[model samples]
Target: ADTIVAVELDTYPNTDIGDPSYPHIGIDIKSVRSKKTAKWNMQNGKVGTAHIIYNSVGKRLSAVVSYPNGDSATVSYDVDLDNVLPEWVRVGLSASTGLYKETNTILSWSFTSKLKSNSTHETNALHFMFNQFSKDQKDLILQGDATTGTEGNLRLTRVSSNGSPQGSSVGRALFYAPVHIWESSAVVASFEATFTFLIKSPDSHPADGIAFFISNIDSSIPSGSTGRLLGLFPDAN
Candidate 1:
């Protein structure tokens, strides 16, 4: 009843209800009974613009409307969303013509929101896990020879590329890590990762194995990392 904040470009007048007799713009905090108002000029077949902004820290809501002509109007009020509304709100747009027979049409509209903090994870759960890699898992990144095969198992290197039996497909697979740090030091504690992998070398000869690792989140795959003994690091075998 008394918790709504709204802006209106009013062209109608009612007697003794505090509405201006001429067309105007109004700002209402608790109810549609505008506490502040400004004169508005109604024009036909002309376009105009309006901007409504909310500053959270400043607890202010300001609006500026530019008419189709060279005229403009401004209005503002101090209000906080936290005090006025619930955490979730249903937003809408509305326009109507009363018995006065005025036609109003909206062309385009958009809304933008700014957050108090950039962090997306707000829950206490600080863990993430993926049981298997699949082609359907869109987030799994495959590089070089890496591919999804046989129920989405990650194939680190493709065997025999372009009609070469021993052609090594040097590739890697990437997945997102639920890790973020801002302004404070957050380190991994009591953390250890376990994995189980089976290496299948076609033609019954063993190829190089694979390893699990952690690197900088922004780190890219090393340029031309070979499919040789890099994983096992065998010296001149």
Candidate 2:
């Protein structure tokens, strides 16, 4: 049995330029050996498909370009498989027309891998689901007079406040726990976290944005780090 990777795309070309033009549909595949890319001529209101296939054990790679009216072409290569694949692969779609604007559509994209799973792994893990708050999970810290409601909800600002005179404000939260992945012997571990956030301003524009970060430092916010820093980077100035 062999491993195969393939891609399929459908495109429409509605933009044009003289001699050479814009609005072309193409696909790109890159591995350790080299990158393979192909493009096809597109017509307005007409559709086409592009494909790239790699035969892992056979050490061959191929690209197919097909369009309406039964016209199609294919290109392929023979290479050393040991040098052709890498730890990671990148697949991409690209289109360029001009200031006039052109668009490319992908009807469907797919991937397949032939690696087997290991059945010997074991773990004792802790899971946290936070739709509410508790004292065991309470390492919550913030600047200013930010308050928490009786129902365990927190607010970063008040409607009557205008922030600081220098246009700087700070609010932060940190949770402390013994995460198993941080243990010295746990060389291979996985983490998944999800959080929802909302931002609102009385004006049409907001001064800054927010960020979610994971760092090695302990629970603390750097002084004078505000605005664009998102309080993550230490203020070097």
Candidate 3:
């Protein structure tokens, strides 16, 4: 599988004199294009964003959303996990949002990491883990309406590669972070989740919205772009 781009932004935790929680990071993605023609990849991080192109040219792209607290959400497409070298691809986002400013939502392209894995475990692991996270409890923590902020959601779209070759596989997974309520600090449980991406015609909607869970309680999974993202949480308003 060809290596797609890997981009990330890391912010050290620093608060003035007595500030506990300083700023919230949000991701905004733009100018995105995909050759797969099956789905467009857009991952909005906390004040940061990512976009990836998916196709069947023995190239696999994985986009991950990581937080300042050491947690992350990943989505990837793999064609030949066995014999592919992953490269760190670069895309651009708006930086007008600026850093540490509450009003600026725009971010620009910073350097990203190149995918390096020598283990066969990494190949074909992209889709398998996605589907695993989708149904696991420890991986995904869902809290219903825990945050006054809009909830989180994941959208999956189906697409075919250039020509359904013999060893081509197109898969996707949605990683959800459910809001939680602890006694003192808010508990946001970050879990690994995976689910099969049901491909539908370029003109139709496929499945129902699924929520994340921690224990037995329902966690908040906000809705996003309806058509492509399966209406996860209505576009990061």
**Number of colliding residue pairs in each model:** 1, 0, 47
Candidate 2 on 1-237: residue-level lDDT in tens?
A: 111122212122222211112222222122111133234443433444444454334556555656668566554566443343232322222111111212222232232323212334544354444445433335444434233442343433322334211235544443334233223333333333333222333332233322222333243445543443233334322
Tens-digit lDDT string for candidate 3 (18-127) = 11232122221210122122222222223323333333333454455433454555545453322322121112111111111111121222221122234443222121
Candidates sorted by TM-score, best first? 1, 2, 3
Residue range 1-237, candidate 1, lDDT tens digits: 112344555545543557676656666654445667777654433455556666455666666667444677776777654565543332212222212222222233334333324345522222333445556647555545455543434445443333222333344454543222121221211122223233322232232223332223443334333432211111112
Ranked candidates, highest lDDT first: 1, 2, 3
Q: In model 3, what is the error at residue 151, expressed in angstroms?
A: 28
Which residue segments of model 2 deviate by more than 4 Å?
A: 1-121, 133-146, 156-167, 182-184
Q: How close is candidate 2 to the true structure, as a TM-score?
A: 0.40
Q: How far out, in Å, is residue 77 in model 1? A: 1.2
RMSD of 1: 27.6
lDDT top scorer: 1
